[PDB]
Amino acid sequence: GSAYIKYYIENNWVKIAFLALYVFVNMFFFMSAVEKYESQGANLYVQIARGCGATLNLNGALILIPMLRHFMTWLRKTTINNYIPIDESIEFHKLVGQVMFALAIVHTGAHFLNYTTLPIPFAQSLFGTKAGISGFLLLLVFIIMWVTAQAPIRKGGKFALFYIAHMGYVLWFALALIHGPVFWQWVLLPVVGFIIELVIRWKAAE
Numbered sequence: 001g002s003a004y005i006k007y008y009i010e011n012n013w014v015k016i017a018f019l020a021l022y023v024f025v026n027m028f029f030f031m032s033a034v035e036k037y038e039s040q041g042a043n044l045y046v047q048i049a050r051g052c053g054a055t056l057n058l059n060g061a062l063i064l065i066p067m068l069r070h071f072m073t074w075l076r077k078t079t080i081n082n083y084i085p086i087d088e089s090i091e092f093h094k095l096v097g098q099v100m101f102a103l104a105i106v107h108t109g110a111h112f113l114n115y116t117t118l119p120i121p122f123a124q125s126l127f128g129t130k131a132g133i134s135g136f137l138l139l140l141v142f143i144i145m146w147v148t149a150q151a152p153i154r155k156g157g158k159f160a161l162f163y164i165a166h167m168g169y170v171l172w173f174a175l176a177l178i179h180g181p182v183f184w185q186w187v188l189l190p191v192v193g194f195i196i197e198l199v200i201r202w203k204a205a206e
């Protein structure tokens with residue numbers, strides 16, 4: 001109840017601040033994209049779709065970081081771990097993945113609604129544009145990864161199905177790079193993360 005919550009907040013204030021920053025940064029990129037498209041005379045569907053898209057870039061930058069296992073294991077042993085629990089890296093990964101799935105659904109729905117406002121048939125917008133085709137494929141990949149990563153499957157005896165489907169992350173990243181064609185800079189964060197992971201693996205290697 002109330003007493004437990006006060007205790008929790010006091011003991012995890014850095015973690016809470018981290019998450020509040022995560023929320024704030026999502027809101028900033030979302031609203032920034034909304035304001036941009038709105039100033040161009042875009043309808044509300046476009047504004048929402050673009051807002052989701054901007055936050056999808058942001059979360060796409062973050063999703064892999066907690067899964068750089070040697071880097072997280074190194075970090076767990078630094079004084080950073082006295083402030084924020086690096087053991088919860090997987091819980092942050094899961095959170096970023098759920099947020100992204102919600103945003104992907106909204107982005108998809110908003111783009112579908114925007115397709116109805118065009119003097120072009122729906123099927124030509126969805127299966128006759130680069131963005132439609134790549135987006136649909138990216139959506140399917142993501143649905144497959146998301147469904148199989150849920151605990152009833154992943155922890156309920158179908159770990160192998162989860163694990164093989166999750167190797168789709170490679171395909172996910174390829175498609176995202178093909179789908180969001182102008183702004184590829186988001187991937188610099190994981191690229192840097194991956195270089196740190198390689199350096200750490202090298203240092204520990206024989």
Ligand code: HEM
Pocket residue numbers: 049050051052053054056057104107108111112126131132134135136137138139142176179180181
């Ligand atoms: C059928 C499903 C989808 C459709 C119809 C769709 C449609 C679009 C369209 C029309 C754009 C603008 C492309 C451009 O400016 O050249 C776009 C951009 C983007 N989409 Fe999708 N998309 C879909 C699924 C997804 C999924 C599943 C994700 C992420 C997991 C995603 C992430 C993005 C991102 C990051 C951008 C670039 C930022 C932006 O302009 O909003 N999309 N999408």
Ligand code: HEM
Pocket residue numbers: 063064067090093094097098100101142145146149150166169172
């Ligand atoms: C686009 C979305 C996602 C990407 C790109 C992604 C990527 C990854 C990667 C690269 C790994 C490490 C794989 C390895 O061990 O070799 C991983 C592990 C994991 N991911 Fe995701 N992931 C996504 C979404 C999700 C979602 C939505 C969930 C859960 C709701 C999730 C749960 C996990 C879990 C639990 C692991 C750890 C498996 C284990 O160590 O037992 N992921 N993810």
Ligand SMILES: CCCCCCCCCC
Pocket residue numbers: 016019020023
């Ligand atoms: C403003 C948003 C802050 C989110 C913190 C929630 C912490 C829940 C830990 C279980």
Ligand SMILES: CCCCCCCCCC
Pocket residue numbers: 109110112113116122
């Ligand atoms: C979730 C949004 C539903 C999209 C409606 C589009 C109907 C297209 C058929 C012409």
Ligand SMILES: CCCCCCCCCC
Pocket residue numbers: 122123126
């Ligand atoms: C009006 C014809 C629309 C056909 C498009 C099929 C959309 C598949 C949604 C998953």
